[PDB]
UniProtKB/Swiss-Prot annotation:
In the N-terminal section; belongs to the cytochrome P450 family. Induction: By pentobarbital. Expression is negatively regulated by repressor bm3R1 at the transcriptional level. It comes from Priestia megaterium (strain ATCC 14581 / DSM 32 / CCUG 1817 / JCM 2506 / NBRC 15308 / NCIMB 9376 / NCTC 10342 / NRRL B-14308 / VKM B-512 / Ford 19) (Bacillus megaterium). Functions as a fatty acid monooxygenase. Catalyzes hydroxylation of fatty acids at omega-1, omega-2 and omega-3 positions. Shows activity toward medium and long-chain fatty acids, with optimum chain lengths of 12, 14 and 16 carbons (lauric, myristic, and palmitic acids). Able to metabolize some of these primary metabolites to secondary and tertiary products. Marginal activity towards short chain lengths of 8-10 carbons. Hydroxylates highly branched fatty acids, which play an essential role in membrane fluidity regulation. The chain holds residues 4 to 456 of 1049 of the full protein. It is found in: Cytoplasm. It comes from the Bacteria. (9Z)-hexadecenoate binds at Y49. This is Bifunctional cytochrome P450/NADPH--P450 reductase. This protein is a target of protein engineering. Its selectivity-directing and activity-enhancing mutations have been extensively studied and the designed mutations allow this enzyme to act on non-native substrates and/or in order to enhance production of synthetically desirable end-products.
Amino acid sequence: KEMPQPKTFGELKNLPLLNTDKPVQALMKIADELGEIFKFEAPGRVTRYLSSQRLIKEACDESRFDKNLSQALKFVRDFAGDGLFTSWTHEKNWKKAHNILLPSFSQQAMKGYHAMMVDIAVQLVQKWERLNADEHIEVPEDMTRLTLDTIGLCGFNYRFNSFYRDQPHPFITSMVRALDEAMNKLQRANPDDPAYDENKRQFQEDIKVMNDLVDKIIADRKASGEQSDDLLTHMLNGKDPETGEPLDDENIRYQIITFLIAGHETTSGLLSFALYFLVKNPHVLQKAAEEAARVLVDPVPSYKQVKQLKYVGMVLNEALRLWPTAPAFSLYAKEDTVLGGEYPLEKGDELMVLIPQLHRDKTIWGDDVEEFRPERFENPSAIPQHAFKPFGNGQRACIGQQFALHEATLVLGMMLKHFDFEDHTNYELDIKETLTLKPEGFVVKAKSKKIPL
Ligand code: HEM
């Protein structure tokens, strides 16, 4: 069977389709037109975009397919190195870091981070409490302040103090620009053309800024000797049970850079989309706010009370269904194989999983896929295998899933406890794409319910 393919541009093939500031959303539109699979070609490379649970469940078979570094991730690898996110499965440092860090990211480990997560969450609530009447909130911006601060504090005992600033930390200016430069190199023609001398000079300056600041944080912790229980202490002391080896300082830096990218980009988006959907669906907002008031009976929320917020968890999973903030991941065929009993693949052939389209698969979810209904995630066992993949697949799934969800559930619980929300502008959804998705310009007013902290 001949594989569907979108419109070509002569010798440039399909590559000019990505020359747009919303490539994922364009690929989603192409998927609606062409269906469950389509071919995508650029000069000297090819991949296949998958959109149905039927094909993606086979793609998620770890005996047949393994994580591939997409072109974007290969560019991100120039500053994320061989950290967990940008390393190949067969690289020694992946399995080492994975075995070392798994216990630090578990559900039990969240009991340890909870205190510091509340520290930052209280700073968000107090900011909003202290706004004057008729002032508004810039939601993505404020969620990013929170999520960046939380990973900095919980991870490496470093306070970015984003709620004390308008202009971001020097690390973040370099990190955001490096990610932008990684994204812009996908849409580019010729690399060594000296017209991009300033692009390369900035990118190398941004690498050095991230490396120097993070390497200083490693050396300062080593020289201190103090044992503040966090990601950095676990990495300096911990040993891989398999090889018996620790991570060296170069890899540790890459893991820290990786966690800062993660805790900045994806996690704030989840909270942003979640609040968007809540203000656009007042009955769902009502249910979640009712739970928050009933469950969060103390001024300082405990770990147990965050686990008790079941409906707030359902709200977040439905936000992850409609707009998964890390919307695509790449795979490659380990051997020759046949996908879906009709698409023969050779060893090394690549696949892209388009997660927003998987999450709109009508044969799994029904015909109302665009509606925001948290009741879909009432029973987690009711969701078929590989139907809901906002945190990726298998051994290369998101190590920060429990961190992200605990943080988002705590913060969204507290937000719903302490405020009523107004969509005062009648905000029209406008999704800006970088590494991740964000509702750009999403604003609300938060009127206080006047419950003390
Ligand atoms: C809403 C929040 C988040 C989402 C939607 C998300 C999504 C994902 C996805 C889809 C992957 C798989 C990438 C691939 O297959 O190429 C992944 C990997 C990863 N994420 Fe996240 N993530 C989130 C938050 C976090 C946080 C907070 C951290 C760390 C503090 C984190 C750390 C990682 C790491 C290290 C990997 C690489 C795992 C490995 O291959 O060993 N993520 N994430």
